[PDB]
Every structure is written in C-alpha cells, then in structure tokens.
Design a protein around this ligand. Structure first.
Ligand code: HEM
Ligand code: HEM
Ligand SMILES: CC(C)(C)OC(=O)N[C@H](CS[C@@H](Cc1ccccc1)C(=O)NCCCc1cccnc1)Cc1ccccc1
Ligand SMILES: CC(C)(C)OC(=O)N[C@H](CS[C@@H](Cc1ccccc1)C(=O)NCCCc1cccnc1)Cc1ccccc1
Lengths: 415, 415
C-alpha cells in the first residue's frame, strides 16, 4: 500500500515484493546490494525495507545538504531503532531536542585536551598488548587478532571512561516494525555498576544529565569503544600482512619518529603521516558503518529533488568508497591515495568513514588515536606474515555488520 | 515503567494500576471521572490512559497558553488515533505541517460568504423536516428526535458539500497502543462516489490537494455533519420540552423576527439573541467533545509548570462547563447566563464547546447556523411536551461518546 512512492516520484529502483519489499536482495549483504544498485540506477535510487521507503543518494552536494546544510531542520534523526527501553536516551538513539542536549553535554569529552590526558593512561595497556603478544609469539602459533585486539579495546574503554583497570531476529524488525512498540511494553550489570568520561558526565552535571540516562551513554561508549576498535585493527593488520612493503614502510616511519622504541605520545602520533594514510585507506576499504541514514522529518526539495516526509535518506558509504568513478583500482589497498600529493583529489562527502555534519562520530578523534597508539606499540615489536589458515582473499561477513567471515589469523615474529 | 511521571513532578492524581493505568475509573464515563478528579485535586492533576500520561489543566491562562499561545510551536497535534489508513490525511487527524496545509486549504469553505450561499439550499430540507414532522404529529404518536433530526442532518451535509439531494474495541487501543501500528499493516462506498465543499476542494485545487486526501476530508465532514447536529438538536428539544417557558419565550422571538412564518434567512438568524442563548446553554450542559487534547511535542514550562514531551495535555470541557466555581446552579438549564447582561461574566477559556485557538472547530459557524435554521422552521410549526416514555431526568451515555442513554422521545403538537 506504499510500494508506489518511488514509482510516483519517478525514482528508479528494484521492484518490491509485498510485505517484504526488497529485503530478499540482502542475501549478499548490504554492501553488495548497494554496489549493484549504484551500478544499475546511477546517482539516486530507492527501495523498501519492508514497507519503509529508503532513498539512496550519491551526489556529493546532495549528501552535503542532508548531512550538514539541512541537519538541524530536516535530517536530524536516524531510522527509528527498537526495542531499546531506557537506551532511548542514548545520544546515538535520541532524537530532535533530546539529542541536541546530549550532544552538547557530551561534546567536551572528545576535545584535543581530553584526548591528550588519556595518552598517558592508554600507554599502559599498549605494553600489556605487546607482552600478551610476546607470549603467543615466542610460542610459534598463529594469533586471532580480534581476541588480542578486543582485550586491548575493552581495557581502554573502561579506564578512559570510568577508571577501572582490568587485564537472527532483526530481519523481522524491518518486516514487522509494527512489532517494535509491542516488545517495548514487553520489556542490569551496569545499571548498578555505574553507581574521565564518567567524571565529566557528572562534571557536566556540576538542564543537567540524569543517571539512568548517564548509564545509557556509558553502555553506548562501551559498544563502539570495543567492537569498532578491534575490528578495524584486525582489518589493518591483514592489509599490512598481505602488503609487506606497506608494513615495512610503516615500521620505518615509526622508528624514525620514535627512535629506541620511544613511548608514543599525543604529539608523536599526529606527526606520522604514513600511519594516518594506512588507517584512512583501511577505513575506505572497510567502512564499518557501511551506510549513513537520516529520516526526512518533513517534505523537502534538496538539490532539485522532492523528498517526502518519513522517507529514510541513505548514503551508501561502502558503495561510494569503492566507486570506480572516484577511485582508480578501487579494490586494491593503496595508501598513497591519502598522501599529501593526492589527498586533495578526495571529496569529503564521498569518503565518510565517520560521517559528516553535526551528527558525525563524536569519538572520531579518540578512535583514530586509540588505534594509532595500538599499531605503534605493536609494530614496534612484531612483524606480521600470512599463515596457512589466513583467509586470502579476505571475505566480508555476508550478514549484517561489517566483519570478516573467518577471523583474521596471522603469524607473529618478534623483531 | 512510566507510572511515576506525575509522582516525580509532584502532580497529584489517582494511583495507576499496572498496564491498565486508570482506565478502570472510566466505568462512570469520561465526564464523571473528570468531575470527580477536578473536585479531588483542584487546578491540575494527571492520570494514565494505560501507559500514556495525561495531564489535566483547568487554569484559564494555562488553557489559553496550550490552545492559542503555544499552538504552532508545541501543542499542535492531538492524541495519535489509529488505525485510520488513508484517513491519516484528514484535517482532524493530520499532524504538524500536513495539518497546516489542510487547514488553509479548507478554511475559506466556512466563511461568512460561503455560509450565506447555503441558507437558500438548507431552507429546502427545513420544510421537508417540518412536513416529515407534520405526518408523525397529526398521528398522535411520540417521535424519536434523533431519527427525524438525523435525516435532516444528512440531507444538509450531502448537498452543502457535494450537491446530492435525497430524502467495544477502543478500550484495548489505550491498553494496547502498540497494537495500533499492527492493525495498520492489516488494513469504499465513497472512494469512488467522490469520483460547495466538493467544489472549493477542487477549486482550491485550481501545493494543491490530492484526491484520496480529498475523499478523507469529505468523510470527516460527513461524520461531524451528521452525528453532532442531530445529537445537539435532540438535547435542545429535550430542554425546551422540560422547560416550557423557555420554549414559548423562544417561539415569541421567532415570530417577532419572522412574522407570518417568514423563511429564516442568514441575517434573520443572527438577529435572534434568545435562540443563540438557548443553543449556547445547551452546549454548556452537553459539550459533545467532552474533552480537548493536545500532545506536548517537546518539553515546556507553561505558566510556571514543567510539562514533559509526549504528555497529552487535556482540557475537561464537561467538568469546566459544570464547575460551581464559575457557574451558579450549574446543573440547571438557565439560558439567561448568556444574556447580554450576563454574557460578560463568562471566561472563553472555561466555556469551550468548539475549542479555541488555531485548531478549533473549523465548522463552528456552519453548525450553529444549521441547527438554528432547523430550530426556527420546527418551532414555527410545532410545540413539544414530555411523554410517558420521556426519560426525565435525562441520563447521559455512561460509555464513550456524549449521547443520551434512552433516545429522546417527546410529544409533538402542531400550532
Ligand atoms: C574506527 C572507529 C569508528 C568509526 C569508523 C565510527 C564511525 C561512525 C559513524 C559513520 C557514525 C555515524 C555518523 C553519521 O551518522 O553521520 C558514528 C556515530 C557515532 N559514534 Fe562512531 N565510529 C568509530 C568509533 C567510535 C568510538 C570509539 C566512539 C566512542 C564514544 C564512537 C561513538 C559514536 C557515537 C556516540 C555516535 C553517534 C553520535 C550521534 O548520533 O550524535 N564511535 N560513528
Ligand atoms: C454542535 C456542533 C459541533 C461542535 C460542538 C463541535 C465541536 C468541536 C470541537 C470541540 C473540536 C475540537 C476543538 C479543539 O480541539 O480545540 C472540533 C473540531 C473539528 N470540527 Fe467540530 N463541532 C461541531 C460540528 C462540526 C461540523 C458541522 C463540522 C463540519 C465540517 C466540524 C468539523 C470539525 C473539524 C474538521 C475539526 C478538526 C479541526 C482541526 O483539527 O483542525 N465540526 N469540533
Ligand atoms: C544501522 C541501521 C541504520 C541500518 O540501523 C540501526 O541499527 N541503527 C543504529 C542503532 S543500534 C545501537 C546498538 C546497540 C544498542 C543497545 C544494545 C545493543 C546494541 C546503537 O545505537 N549503536 C550506536 C553505537 C555508536 C557507534 C557504532 C559504530 C561506529 N561508531 C559508533 C544507529 C547507528 C548506525 C550506524 C552507526 C552509528 C549508529
Ligand atoms: C477523543 C479522543 C481524543 C479521546 O480520541 C479520539 O478519538 N480522537 C479523535 C479522532 S476519531 C475520528 C472519527 C472517525 C474517523 C474515521 C472513521 C470513523 C470515525 C475523527 O478524527 N473525528 C473528527 C470529526 C470532527 C468533529 C467531531 C466532533 C465534533 N466536531 C467535529 C479526534 C477528535 C476528538 C474530539 C473532537 C474532534 C476530533
């Protein structure tokens, strides 16, 4: 009863089936579906997540309009996600004025000054990461990176935020979004554990912040602080192993900036350009968000195109990061794309690993620093080679979230 | 999990039961529940329609703030009603900017000029109403008013709007509002019959109006144009029968303005003050809307009182129309309250039979004229006396909508 929206507007796209819409095309993942649609319809197309119309845009100006120019006015909130419960007060989930309050309350936590305070604290768990790698390296045995990276990722998020130091169904959500309010009325490790980030959240309480709403942000920061950091670091070391010349050229820069295995400081990390080039190129190949979404809260006509209320505007970050119309040989791992000689030829609204506009990743600078502090301390001590069980080429998880199919396993040799 | 909102805010009210909230108190109707709550907690109280918090206000300034001062900004929409289907595009149901468009598109239909055009058309069915009453009067037999009034009400709405001339479950809606989106995906006499009001709706099409959205307004105008007119006219004739002095004093004014049973014109109706006093007093005793509601779309602090987002602000029109703190002997039918000697002592935010602010009854002036044109032609020919089966005193429908329990039946005598 709503599958004729894009047909009325003259917007191309795949023909939706009743109830299901176009979800059956997700059998190859969100990424392959966006790449195929981008090659079939061009700059703009639409589809249906069940009965929910989703409009996809690939025009950099139109992307700037949604993410930056018309953020506070029209494209303020993402697709409604539930059931969440008390997590509705989370900044990544809150909407409209409730989000505007949380954004300002939590913004001063990721400043250039607050990050510099965490470098002396993070430098501890970097050495634990090396010494935990030193054990599984002297013993000739392939290492699951996401395990030793996830242990480092959780050790950082619990101390930077609080100070603690320690060593299948969403498919029906899109088909049955009417069942989301159902589960809300159908209804703890942290609801009392909360009873630094945690400091400022009470120091931005001295229009203040609640407590159940303080826990919700802490849980959110623990999610993204754990899974995103470990998953990207795994993606990086796979590329460094499958491209040994890049791994060595990176090791040469680390030793030049940090001789005698110097401790990586805040200022020494921002000086390494080839390290940032490797991180940015890996994030181009593997944008863990895959997609950026905004809900059209009222009828608009952006860049000469009518968009009706309720439509979910989507930006296919993965499909744009691998578009041959912007990247030469887009499947190859080439960090020289982000060299200061070639960095100018990159549209910031085509390359969006952290989003754009007022609602981008608030912890972008923290995530870049955390991963760079991890790579520096690890590559200072070890080199990485592919193993017999190393999945080459690496398959992406055909499911929902952006992960490798088989875990990344490489050989570790101590320098 | 949300029954502590008014307890946190220090707002009094009845203690809600889990899931049900306070709906069990509706066993005496919305009206008796509001009257008892108004006497128990005073100016402001709160309750829960299941899990939905509803705040009741009785302060005229605070009522003016919600209905008039902060309408476009905060209190723009009513309680979400569903499942409606295509009727979501109806002006009484539409929200935010969609309603603002429909209001302006349909406003010029109820001007003082458009009503004057319908007086020569309505005057036809007034004589049919008399001649249909003349048959059941020469035959000594009590008449069900709502039947002969409903036949007149439908004959007017179909010709004024188009030109055609022809002679149990909502309880679960409040407990299970999560089931409303369910029924929406679960899914005609007028969807093709539409294929004057109907004129202007296409003449306000020559940012225009749709067609399925044109039918939705036509159906809405047929609802209120049928049930409201007949129900109030029944309430009026009961009061005129149970107060024969008022019925005669009204008959004297009608014959003075319209001698020799003159045809009631637009200008002759607005001259009769005692007729308007009878209509206004009946609407005080019987405000068919009972309640006025606005959804708080964002946190506000109106008249020194914090109100959170999502709360349904409610104005108990019935309870305020019978408040002894504003009306002396509020249960008695006394049209002299609206005399030009005493009309000044009436707060327009306490007496709201048609609402107030930008979202009041758009067909207020049409309804007043339609009923007055009906009373004039009927009282010119007949007098009304109570019968053996006349329910004296009249009981109100203890259920949902404001109706009499037993239908109003009176004796009719031709003058
Ligand atoms: C490699 C690491 C990360 C990447 C690539 C990444 C990427 C993203 C992207 C693409 C968005 C959406 C931007 C948009 O919608 O325009 C986002 C949102 C967000 N990210 Fe991250 N993220 C990373 C790590 C983190 C970390 C460590 C945190 C720590 C708190 C974090 C917190 C958030 C929050 C709170 C939001 C929602 C902000 C809002 O809705 O206002 N992310 N991230
Ligand atoms: C005795 C007769 C009537 C009474 C007492 C009455 C009363 C009311 C009241 C109290 C409201 C809500 C006002 C508010 O929320 O502030 C309303 C709304 C409305 N009424 Fe009536 N009404 C009557 C007859 C009619 C008629 C004949 C029409 C013909 C079209 C009509 C059309 C509407 C509409 C469309 C709305 C919603 C307006 C909007 O939401 O913008 N009503 N009425
Ligand atoms: C992706 C899309 C649009 C198709 O549907 C959605 O699932 N919507 C996302 C909401 S799920 C929720 C995760 C969660 C909450 C409670 C318990 C378990 C799990 C969340 O709010 N997590 C935000 C974490 C911050 C983050 C994550 C990744 C990278 N950097 C930062 C909203 C969303 C989507 C994409 C990026 C960010 C946020
Ligand atoms: C009352 C409350 C707040 C507790 O819940 C609601 O049921 N909400 C009302 C929505 S029901 C709908 C009626 C209908 C639609 C399709 C098919 C069958 C029935 C409607 O939109 N009818 C508006 C008709 C205009 C009118 C009616 C009466 C007097 N004058 C004008 C919204 C509402 C409430 C009170 C007054 C006006 C509108």
């Amino acid at each position: 009863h709503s599958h004729g929206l894009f047909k009325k507007l003259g917007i191309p796209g795949p023909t939706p089936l009743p109830f299901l819409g176009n979800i059956l095309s997700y059998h190859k993942g969100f990424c392959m579906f966006d790449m195929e649609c981008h090659k079939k319809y061009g700059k703009v197309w639409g589809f249906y997540d069940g009965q929910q119309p989703v409009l996809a845009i690939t025009d950099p100006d139109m992307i700037k309009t949604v993410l930056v120019k018309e953020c506070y006015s029209v494209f303020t909130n993402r697709r409604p996600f539930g059931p969440v419960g008390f997590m509705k007060s989370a900044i990544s989930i809150a909407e409209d004025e409730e989000w505007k309050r949380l954004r300002s309350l939590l913004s001063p936590t990721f400043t250039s000054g607050k990050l510099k305070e965490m470098v002396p604290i993070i430098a501890q768990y970097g050495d634990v990461l090396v010494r935990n790698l030193r054990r599984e390296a002297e013993t000739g045995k392939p290492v699951t990176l996401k395990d030793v990276f996830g242990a480092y990722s959780m050790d950082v998020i619990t101390s930077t935020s609080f100070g603690v130091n320690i060593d299948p169904f969403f498919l029906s959500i899109t088909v049955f979004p009417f069942l989301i309010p159902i589960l809300e009325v159908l209804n703890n490790f942290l609801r009392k554990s909360v009873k630094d980030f945690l400091q400022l959240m009470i120091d931005s309480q001295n229009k203040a912040l609640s407590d159940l709403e303080l826990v919700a942000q802490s849980i959110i920061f623990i999610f993204a602080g754990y899974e995103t950091t470990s998953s990207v670091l795994s993606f990086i070391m796979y590329e460094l192993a499958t491209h040994p010349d890049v791994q060595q050229k990176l090791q040469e820069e680390i030793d030049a900036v940090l001789p005698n295995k110097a401790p990586p400081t805040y200022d020494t990390v921002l000086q390494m350009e080839y390290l940032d080039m490797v991180v940015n190129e890996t994030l181009r190949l593997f944008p863990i968000a895959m997609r950026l979404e905004r809900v059209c809260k009222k009828d608009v006509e952006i860049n000469g195109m009518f968009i009706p209320k309720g439509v979910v505007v989507m930006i296919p970050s993965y499909a744009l990061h691998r578009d041959p119309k912007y990247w030469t040989e887009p499947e190859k791992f080439l960090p020289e794309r982000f060299s200061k000689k070639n960095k100018d030829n990159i549209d910031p609204y085509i390359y969006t690993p952290f989003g754009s506009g007022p609602r981008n990743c608030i912890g972008m600078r923290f995530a870049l620093m955390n991963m760079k502090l991890a790579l520096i301390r690890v590559l200072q001590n070890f080199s990485f080679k592919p193993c017999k069980e190393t999945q080459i080429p690496l398959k992406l998880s055909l499911g929902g979230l952006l992960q490798p199919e088989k875990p990344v396993v490489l050989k570790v040799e101590s320098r």
